Amino acid sequence: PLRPRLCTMKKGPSGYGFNLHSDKSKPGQFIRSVDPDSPAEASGLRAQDRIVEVNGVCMEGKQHGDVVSAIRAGGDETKLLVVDRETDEFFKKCRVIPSQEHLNGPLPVPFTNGEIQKENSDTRL
Amino acid sequence: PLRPRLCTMKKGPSGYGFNLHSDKSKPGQFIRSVDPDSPAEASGLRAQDRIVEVNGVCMEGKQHGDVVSAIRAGGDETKLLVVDRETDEFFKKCRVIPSQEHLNGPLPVPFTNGEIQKENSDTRL
């Protein structure tokens, strides 16, 4: 497969029904669990997904509470852009942060080992 | 023990007979003094106790004036849930706010340093 997935869900009587986890061992906010028959599960959210965007705003580099505040501040609805591990394990090789562009359109091309061997440092100024 | 204590007291001609203190050095509302032969002392209230609930309403996170106004608005009787200094340090190590449930039920299990060393951040959504 290897594309990100957008999860649109509406708050139920007791929330969305999933668990977000993060720790110092790795970067990123991950779905530890999703309750059965929950709004989160119906939208297509699954365990071990990593949150990339919350309602069209990028979450790369932000802390856990920032993502949590971003989700709680969206009202009774939220739209999460998420990637599974294999899709996540692909985009780092492209060195590309996933976005809404990748839901439909052409996917990036990974970098070869020889290109990383060059140890290039490039900056657009 | 290590459980909290409920202090039910009725206003005397000159109040309950205790003084409440707080300052910037520490969070929480603490009992600095309790008069002898006072309604507060008979109920079991002691100095250095920290107030957690006022008439079944938790006060964790509240300001000093909020707790005072809550006590004055309860009429001439009040039920205070309090913890001594030692009890407070145990619920902190458990990361659990005491409640009426800890008057009777099983006490929580503290977090180990290795689990806190991981600095995990989990959120129910």
Swiss-Prot record, chains A, B:
Q: What is the induction note for this entry?
A: By estrogen.
Signal peptide range? none
> Where in the numbering of this chain does the PDZ domain appear?
6-86
Tissue expression from the record:
Detected in liver, kidney, pancreas, prostate, spleen, small intestine and placenta, in particular in the syncytiotrophoblast.
Query: Where, subcellularly, is it found?
Result: Cytoplasm; Apical cell membrane; Endomembrane system; Cell projection, Filopodium
Q: Which residues carry this modification: Phosphoserine?
A: 14, 121
Tell me which domain of life the UniProt entry assigns to the organism this sequence originates from.
Answer: Eukaryota
UniProt modification remark: Phosphorylated on serine residues.
- Subunit description: Homodimer, and heterodimer with NHERF2. Binds the N-termini of EZR, RDX and MSN. Binds the C-termini of PDGFRA, PDGFRB, ADRB2, NOS2 and CFTR. Binds ARHGAP17, EPI64, RACK1, OPRK1, GNAQ, CTNNB1 and PLCB3. Binds PDZK1. Interacts with CLCN3. Binds the C-terminus of PAG1. In resting T-cells, part of a PAG1-NHERF1-MSN complex which is disrupted upon TCR activation. Forms a complex with CFTR and SLC4A7. Forms a complex with SLC4A7 and ATP6V1B1. Interacts with TRPC4 (via the PDZ-binding domain). Directly interacts with HTR4.
- Clinical disorder: Nephrolithiasis/osteoporosis, hypophosphatemic, 2: A disease characterized by decreased renal phosphate absorption, renal phosphate wasting, hypophosphatemia, hyperphosphaturia, hypercalciuria, nephrolithiasis and osteoporosis.
Q: What does this protein do?
A: Scaffold protein that connects plasma membrane proteins with members of the ezrin/moesin/radixin family and thereby helps to link them to the actin cytoskeleton and to regulate their surface expression. Necessary for recycling of internalized ADRB2. Was first known to play a role in the regulation of the activity and subcellular location of SLC9A3. Necessary for cAMP-mediated phosphorylation and inhibition of SLC9A3. May enhance Wnt signaling. May participate in HTR4 targeting to microvilli. Involved in the regulation of phosphate reabsorption in the renal proximal tubules.
Protein's name according to its UniProt entry: Na(+)/H(+) exchange regulatory cofactor NHE-RF1
Q: Which organism is it from?
A: Homo sapiens
Coding gene? NHERF1
